[PDB]
Design a protein around this ligand. Structure first.
Ligand code: VYJ
Length: 118
């Protein structure tokens, strides 16, 4: 999940940008806090969450993956962000607050990624 002995990982120029520009800009958004940690289906009372969401993802995991050089390339790290936002749209109702919070964060994600080098 945040490290794998058989998985090749490294740090590239792009992966440094994911960590120092993308993760770090988003972590400081006032709507980011629900994504610091995995969805806790006990605390939030979500008996069906892990039946609908097959691959949970959050920014804490991503951040930790970056610090561990878990990833091979930055597009792999972008896929994790997409999973995290997409899970949010999939599980929740169209007008739920968390949907509108994920959309605002996702927009900034793309603006930052649009300036990534290479
Ligand atoms: C570890 C924090 O975790 C959460 C906490 C609380 C909470 O009650 N606190 C926050 C801190 C408390 N202190 C301490 C004592 N002191 C005196 C005052 C301050 C005060 C009350 C609420 C939601 C949380 N965490 C969450 N993580 C993913 C999700 C998530 N909430 N939301 C919600 C986020 C906001 C709207 C929806 C979801 C809800 C239902 C279904 C899915 C999802 C979902 O998709 N995600 C991504």
């Amino acid at each position: 999940e945040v490290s794998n002995p058989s998985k090749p990982g490294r740090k590239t120029n792009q992966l440094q940008y994911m960590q120092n520009v993308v993760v770090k800009t988003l972590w400081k958004h006032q709507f980011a806090w629900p994504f610091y940690q995995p969805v806790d289906a006990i605390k939030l009372n979500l008996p069906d969450y892990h039946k609908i969401i097959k691959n949970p993802m959050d920014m804490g995991t991503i951040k930790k993956r970056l610090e561990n050089n878990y990833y091979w390339s930055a597009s792999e790290c972008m896929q994790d962000f997409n999973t995290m936002f997409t899970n949010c749209y999939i599980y929740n109702k169209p007008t739920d607050d968390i949907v509108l919070m994920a959309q605002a964060l996702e927009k900034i994600f793309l603006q930052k990624v649009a300036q990534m080098p290479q």
